[PDB]
Design a protein around this ligand. Structure first.
Ligand SMILES: [Mg+2]
Ligand SMILES: [Mg+2]
Ligand SMILES: [Mg+2]
Ligand SMILES: [Mg+2]
Ligand SMILES: [Mg+2]
Ligand SMILES: [Mg+2]
Ligand SMILES: [Mg+2]
Ligand SMILES: [Mg+2]
Ligand SMILES: [Mg+2]
Ligand SMILES: [Mg+2]
Ligand SMILES: [Mg+2]
Ligand SMILES: [Mg+2]
Ligand SMILES: [Mg+2]
Ligand SMILES: [Mg+2]
Ligand SMILES: [Mg+2]
Ligand SMILES: [Mg+2]
Ligand SMILES: [Mg+2]
Ligand SMILES: [Mg+2]
Ligand SMILES: [Mg+2]
Ligand SMILES: [Mg+2]
Ligand SMILES: [Mg+2]
Ligand SMILES: [Mg+2]
Ligand SMILES: [Mg+2]
Ligand SMILES: [Mg+2]
Ligand SMILES: [Mg+2]
Ligand SMILES: [Mg+2]
Ligand SMILES: [Mg+2]
Ligand SMILES: [Mg+2]
Ligand SMILES: [Mg+2]
Ligand SMILES: [Mg+2]
Ligand SMILES: [Mg+2]
Ligand SMILES: [Mg+2]
Ligand SMILES: [Mg+2]
Ligand SMILES: [Zn+2]
Lengths: 134, 158, 50, 86, 52, 135, 122
RNA sequence: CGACUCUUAGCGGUGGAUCACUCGGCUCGUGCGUCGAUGAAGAACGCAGCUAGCUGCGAGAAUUAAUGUGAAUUGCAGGACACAUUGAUCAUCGACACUUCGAACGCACUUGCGGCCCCGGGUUCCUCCCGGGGCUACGCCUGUCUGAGCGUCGCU
RNA sequence: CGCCGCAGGUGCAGAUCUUGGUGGUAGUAGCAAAUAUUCAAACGAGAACUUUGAAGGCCGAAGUGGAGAAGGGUUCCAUGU
RNA sequence: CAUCUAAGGCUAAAUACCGGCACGAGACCGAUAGUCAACAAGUACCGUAAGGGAAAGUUGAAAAGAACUUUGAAGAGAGAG
RNA sequence: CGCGACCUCAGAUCAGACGUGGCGACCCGCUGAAUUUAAGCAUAUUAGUCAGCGGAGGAGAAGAAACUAACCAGGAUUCCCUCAGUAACGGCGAGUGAACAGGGAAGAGCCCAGCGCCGAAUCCCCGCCCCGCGGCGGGGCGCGGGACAUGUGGCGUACGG
């Protein structure tokens, strides 16, 4: 279990940190698993969600194999918005439905210098872990 | 109000005792802190004995206890003189010195200086500059023979 | 009174600006938890400290 | 008459705002605040009112300097140095 | 806080209870009565070699 | 002596506390002189004092002070102790020689009241109920 | 469009002041537009111009301060805002030189009778 | 028969108990154990595009710089931002800055009024007015300069 | 939640009990100090009370008039509800 | 006879800690309880002042927070969603 | 009858420094009740406590015997256990009440004044040069200024020197 005397298992504390987290670690909390192909190509498992990467919903009301591009990351509400995951309200307009990023899988990444560096870092660490366990 | 037989009890609780109550909830935490500082101190003085300087043989004062021998504060000046150890050098090789204890008998004096002669022979003295040994000790005699002693130095027994 | 010192006039000025209703758009903020202005003061009901 | 009628005659203020401590206890005719004792060099503070002490103690205001001090203590009160530039 | 939360038990008594608890961990009826599913166990005072 | 400062000499209480006159301050006049010199010279550290004269209504003492921030004091050891923060206003705490005498400090049977550092330290230890963990 | 402190540090104090004057006039025009109705785009530029003024001022103040530190570098007496600001208590402490110096008696004691490294056989 | 009153049940009100929940306490323990004339604690007043409070901040005012991070903030708007001729946001914070009171310090305040030394403007440098800057508290140590005394003397 | 143990801030009708809520009283007492209102019109869904006009009256210059001090602190003034 | 050497000075450790910074935990309380304060709480408000000082948690997974029609001047309704 | 030296004093917006105020849980110095108990109450108790005043630090205070003992003697201070609800105090009533020895935690010692000896060997400040900035120092130079024989520094302190 947990043997670090300086890490809390208190439910009240862990919830307080989670719901009052700053934006830069709300980014880490709002992470998403990669697809089977992406987990194959890069040796990483989960990646923090981005503004313009393509995910598909796997749980809830909007499940399916439909891939939608992310169009908003509402970190204050701990949700993301997707292209076709939307709901038509009373006055006829359309609104987006917030989806917790842990309920989607990234199928295509929005890649640049920083995302390349973070992916290389996680692959390097995981390789170190397996070669230490070998 | 007294009720039948009983003791005449006089508790001393007329004096607002609740404002000053010593709780011992930090007793286990104090033991841990003390034991950590004991381990750290033993690590700091690496080859020197953990408990500290060697203490003399001493007879307890009153008639209730004069049949018992314990470890005193430090060696007297007469003891160190006839052991031939300078008073300002004894405390540098790990010998406690108590200038204010005087010897009324030669029996306790002879016992304590035999203790100092034994200790001086048991001592291992590392040279001050490790590369240059002047009069300290043999390199074979301290290569691994010198290890940190635990417990009191030459413990006193009855 | 008409004759007032500058410190008093500066004090009443703050109390004047502070006594206004909350903005309409405040309620739309996420996790608002504010209904109206609870610190609203009326001149004829509650008198200022000074 | 001691009741309602005498309450009409009260129109002269006894206390005003104190420039230290900002409370309306600066007795005008004594020139001494009844809460902090302003003209005195020391803050008026009595142990018989723990509630009054904690209404005005350190930390009930802003601590503009102290909150910075609590931050700087963690790093040893370093000055005259900057992080490694990129 | 000075409610006397702790109790001291005699050392001889504490060793006594240890001896009894050990003695009961060797009777299959008592362990089964604790509900421990000791039915395919080959021998109730189960001992293994030191390799584990 | 120290006349009790009560209006009109009325101490409202039991007759044991009806004393107004014949009451003696717990600290010597020499301790008062050191305190008054130190409070005036709040930037200096009182070291000691001595008696230089007296008449029927006055006592005269001369008080030795040290400036803690003078370089002649700070660049000399064996007098650097006066420059440490714990050694400031010793006269207001009864740490000077004249102030210490009024505290009953000493070694021996005559001075059991301050076994522990001071009278209040000894009183505290004697009047604190050690409620252990295992009673 | 924006103003960066990184490339302001190469300028002269003359056109740094001139740049600040241009921003000050920009801000006053923006405040005029605010009370004459104005537009959303104009009102939103108020924050940007205010931040740019703070940025230009901070570069000016930093350049001036670091020149003053270089000028008084090594001089015996320095202004109070150029001295260290550790803590009032920490400033009254003895310095490192005179916390380490010892009496000639203490030096002689350590020269004659230094603490030895010893061990005791079992 | 209706009305009214009483009893019971259903439904509906009034009220907010119960239960479930908990970014709050209380208690214990651990490590540190750091304020201030280089202006503290505290107070006042201001500062957001829309902002009353709480929060944050100080005329550079819901923040500047630097560093880490690496695409948001978000109630609406608006606007950057090739994220590499450098970067939204957040975190840190060591650079800079930090209005007026306040030990509070030129004097004084339920108001206000000075003095000295420079700079700039009207003057067209001399001293009037206006603006800007720096000083102007008490106690006290070392030293300095200027001194006082029919204090003790020396020479005249 | 049951069973074997453990530990309690462990059982309410009362305390002129604490806090909160709710009744009968009860559509009840009352909305009676300083003479007094009426007609037509307008706006308006709506008029005894608003507004305008026409009357009849009151304050009666020690005023129910016109201004200030202390105190209040935006009550001042327009527009809208 | 024993014992010390006053009227000068310094000195770490073991010890204390209901305030402060940052943590960890609990056979504790669970919104009339627990801090007065789970919430814009030493706040609102009271008193000339010293000082006194509360009440106040919960839609829902997601606002999807009831478009549209209809009677009413609107509050408020009937459908619809 | 002017000019010097010293002494004792004064001024300064003089050069460089320092103190004030806050917090105050813990610590130190003072001041200090009454409710209460005594089945009344006055000594006593509450209590050297609440309230009051001053002063600190991360701890403080204490502290290296003008000690304890009476022994076959121990050996600075502080803290824990015990001595001990004891010796003792007390309208000897109610009530109050330590210490030594013993076992532990920690353990560490020293410096002046004086008596002397050493050509004041001592110290601060101001300059200038060089090596350095981190808690401002070192080295050198000054017929540079002052402190100081009304006594600075070195040896030395009861364990003797
Ligand atoms: Mg009985
Ligand atoms: Mg009124
Ligand atoms: Mg009056
Ligand atoms: Mg010497
Ligand atoms: Mg920035
Ligand atoms: Mg005036
Ligand atoms: Mg003369
Ligand atoms: Mg109960
Ligand atoms: Mg009940
Ligand atoms: Mg009931
Ligand atoms: Mg009953
Ligand atoms: Mg009626
Ligand atoms: Mg009527
Ligand atoms: Mg008339
Ligand atoms: Mg009028
Ligand atoms: Mg009007
Ligand atoms: Mg509550
Ligand atoms: Mg409830
Ligand atoms: Mg209505
Ligand atoms: Mg000066
Ligand atoms: Mg009685
Ligand atoms: Mg009675
Ligand atoms: Mg009585
Ligand atoms: Mg009495
Ligand atoms: Mg007190
Ligand atoms: Mg103070
Ligand atoms: Mg000390
Ligand atoms: Mg001491
Ligand atoms: Mg001695
Ligand atoms: Mg017994
Ligand atoms: Mg007593
Ligand atoms: Mg030991
Ligand atoms: Mg000498
Ligand atoms: Zn005040």
């Amino acid at each position: 279990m947990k043997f670090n005397p300086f890490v809390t298992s208190d439910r009240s504390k862990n919830r307080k940190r989670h719901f009052n987290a700053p934006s830069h670690i709300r980014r880490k909390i709002m992470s998403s698993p990669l697809s089977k192909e992406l987990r194959q190509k890069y040796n990483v498992r989960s990646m923090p969600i981005r503004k313009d990467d393509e995910v598909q919903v796997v749980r809830g009301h909007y499940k399916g194999q439909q891939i939608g591009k992310v169009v908003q990351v509402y970190r204050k509400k701990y949700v993301i918005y997707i292209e076709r995951v939307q709901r038509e309200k009373a006055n006829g307009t359309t609104v987006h439905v917030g989806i917790h990023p842990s309920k989607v899988v990234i199928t295509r990444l929005k890649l640049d210098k920083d995302r390349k560096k973070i992916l290389e870092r996680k692959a390097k660490s995981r390789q170190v872990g397996k070669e230490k366990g070998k | 109000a007294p009720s039948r037989n009983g003791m005449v009890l006089k508790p001393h609780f007329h004096k607002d005792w609740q404002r000053r109550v010593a709780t011992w909830f930090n007793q286990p935490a104090r033991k841990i802190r003390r034991r950590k500082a004991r381990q750290a101190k033993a690590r700091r003085i690496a080859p020197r004995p953990a408990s500290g300087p060697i203490r003399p043989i001493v007879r307890c004062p009153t008639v209730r206890y004069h049949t018992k021998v314990r470890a005193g504060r430090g060696f007297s000046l007469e003891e160190l003189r006839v052991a031939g150890i300078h008073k300002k050098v004894a405390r540098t090789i790990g010998i406690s010195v108590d200038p204010r204890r005087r010897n009324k008998s030669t029996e306790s004096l002879q016992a304590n200086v035999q203790r100092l002669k034994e200790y001086r022979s048991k001592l291992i003295l590392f040279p001050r500059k490790p590369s240059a040994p002047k009069k300290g000790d043999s390199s074979a005699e301290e290569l691994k023979l010198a290890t940190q002693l635990t417990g009191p130095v030459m413990p006193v027994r009855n | 009174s008409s004759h007032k010192t500058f410190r008093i006039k500066r004090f009443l000025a703050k109390k004047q600006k502070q006594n206004r209703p909350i903005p309409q758009w405040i309620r739309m903020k996420t996790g608002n938890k504010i209904r109206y202005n609870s610190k609203r003061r009326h001149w004829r009901r509650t008198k200022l400290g000074l | 008459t001691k009741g309602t009628s005498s309450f009409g005659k009260r129109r002269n203020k006894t206390h005003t705002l104190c420039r230290r401590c900002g409370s309306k206890a600066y007795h005008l005719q004594k020139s001494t605040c009844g809460k902090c004792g302003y003209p005195a060099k020391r803050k008026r503070k009595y142990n018989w009112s723990a509630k009054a002490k904690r209404r005005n103690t350190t930390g009930t205001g802003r601590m503009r300097h102290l909150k910075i001090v609590y931050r700087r203590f963690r790093h040893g009160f370093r000055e005259g140095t900057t992080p490694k530039p990129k | 806080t000075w409610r006397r939360w702790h109790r001291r038990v005699n050392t001889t008594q504490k060793r006594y209870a240890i001896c009894s608890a050990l003695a009961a961990s060797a009777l299959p009826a008592l362990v089964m009565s604790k509900g421990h599913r000791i039915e395919e166990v080959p021998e109730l005072p189960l001992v293994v070699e030191d390799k584990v | 002596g120290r006349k009790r400062p009560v209006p009109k000499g009325a101490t409202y209480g039991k007759p044991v506390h009806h004393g107004v006159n014949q009451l003696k301050f717990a600290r010597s006049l020499q301790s008062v002189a050191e305190e008054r010199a130190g409070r005036h010279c709040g930037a200096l550290r009182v070291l000691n004092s001595y008696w230089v004269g007296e008449d029927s209504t006055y006592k005269f003492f001369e008080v030795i002070l040290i400036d803690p921030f003078h370089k002649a004091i700070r660049r000399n050891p064996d007098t650097q102790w006066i420059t440490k923060p714990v050694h400031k206003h010793r006269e207001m705490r009864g740490l000077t020689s004249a102030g210490r005498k009024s505290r009953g400090l000493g070694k021996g049977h005559k001075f059991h009241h301050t076994i522990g550092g001071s009278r209040r330290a000894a009183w505290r230890r004697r009047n604190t109920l050690q409620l252990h963990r295992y009673r | 469009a924006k103003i960066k402190a990184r490339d302001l540090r190469g300028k002269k104090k003359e056109e740094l002041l001139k740049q600040l004057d241009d921003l000050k006039v920009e801000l006053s025009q923006l405040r005029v537009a605010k009370v004459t109705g104005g537009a959303a785009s104009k009102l939103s530029k108020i924050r940007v111009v205010r931040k740019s003024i703070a940025r230009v001022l901070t570069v000016i103040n930093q350049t001036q301060k670091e020149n003053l530190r270089k000028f008084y570098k090594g001089k015996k007496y320095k202004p109070l805002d150029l001295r260290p600001k550790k803590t009032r208590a920490m400033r009254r402490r003895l310095n490192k030189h005179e916390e380490n110096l010892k009496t000639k008696k203490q030096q002689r004691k350590e020269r004659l009778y230094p603490l030895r490294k010893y061990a005791v056989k079992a």
